[PDB]
């Protein structure tokens, strides 16, 4: 019995419940072991055969590509990333009481009991763009331990529903719409480090990572526009970096708001002149908001 990605399945387990992300578009994974190795050249005997031992599982990266789904289940990714939640609203807390990131657990399932299980994991990145294409959400995860296993927890009601219909992006400031959009791209992060725990007590045992601590969070965005001016002497659309701009970005079904932001600009003399805005919140800014709305 072989195995096939085209009929693989992914299940996320947390809080003693399980989430079936049915609408997976892609995923990629590796697994590896670390080894210690020495060749011990010695003038008595210039040994040619190395001496080596396997010690530890490498921390696997995981990468996922997911389509937006009506029934919104993927909002739990932001919940696990560490946004606070208010119904469908998510907020960054201006300062955070966490030290450890939210640990959770993953099954990869296939026919013939041919299953794999990743025991301790955390989200490191969520990242997407509204670039004139069906918005696909990337996720970066790390996991500290894996094993193969014969079985998995069933999950059947918490299934990611049908994909939401396409709609075009809008950008605005104080209800001014912004002319000549080209793209918007967003990323959110939870930078972390594993605490190295290996000890001489672990000798002749295989070792794993077990705990990590949160270094940082980031929220940031990029916008691409065509260069435009209202009249030659105008000042509002100049190059110079504005600051304390309130900024709002939405589709039909998703909304993001920065109450105050700092804008860098870069200009490119491509065949049509292009401008990139780099966006970041200001230190005094209020909580950035995210909302989701289901299509009827």
């Amino acid at each position: 019995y072989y195995s096939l990605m085209r009929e693989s399945k992914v299940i996320v387990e947390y809080d003693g419940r399980a989430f079936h992300f049915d609408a997976l578009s892609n995923y990629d994974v590796q697994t590896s072991y670390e080894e210690f190795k020495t060749l011990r050249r010695t003038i008595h005997r210039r040994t040619n055969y190395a001496d080596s031992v396997i010690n530890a599982q490498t921390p696997s990266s995981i990468s996922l590509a997911i389509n937006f789904s009506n029934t919104l289940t993927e909002a739990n990714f932001f919940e696990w990333l560490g946004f606070d939640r208010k119904g469908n609203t998510f907020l960054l807390p201006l300062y955070s009481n966490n030290i450890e990131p939210i640990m959770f657990n993953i099954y990869i399932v296939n026919k013939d009991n041919n299953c794999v299980y990743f025991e301790n994991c955390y989200v490191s990145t969520v990242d997407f763009s509204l670039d004139k294409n069906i918005p696909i959400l990337n996720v970066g995860i790390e996991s500290g331990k894996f094993s193969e296993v014969s079985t998995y927890r069933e999950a059947a009601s918490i299934i990611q529903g049908e994909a939401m219909s396409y709609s075009p992006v809008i950008v605005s400031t104080n209800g001014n719409i912004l002319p000549g959009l080209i793209s918007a791209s967003l990323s959110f992060q939870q930078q972390c480090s594993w605490r190295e725990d290996k000890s001489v007590f672990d000798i002749n045992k295989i070792y794993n990572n077990k705990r990590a601590y949160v270094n940082e969070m980031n929220a940031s965005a990029t916008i691409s526009l065509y260069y435009l001016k209202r009249f030659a002497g105008d000042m509002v659309y100049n190059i110079e970096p504005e600051t304390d701009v309130p900024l709002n970005i939405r589709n039909n079904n998703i909304s993001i708001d920065f109450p105050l932001a700092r804008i860098s600009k870069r200009l490119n003399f491509s065949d049509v002149y292009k401008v990139e805005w780099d966006i970041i919140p200001t230190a005094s800014s209020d909580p950035v908001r995210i909302d989701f709305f289901g299509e009827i």
Binding site: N113, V149, S150, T151, R153
Partner: peptide, 8 residues
């Protein structure tokens, strides 16, 4: 986790 009831 789950019980690993399945053994052949």
């Amino acid at each position: 986790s789950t019980e690993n009831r399945v053994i052949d």
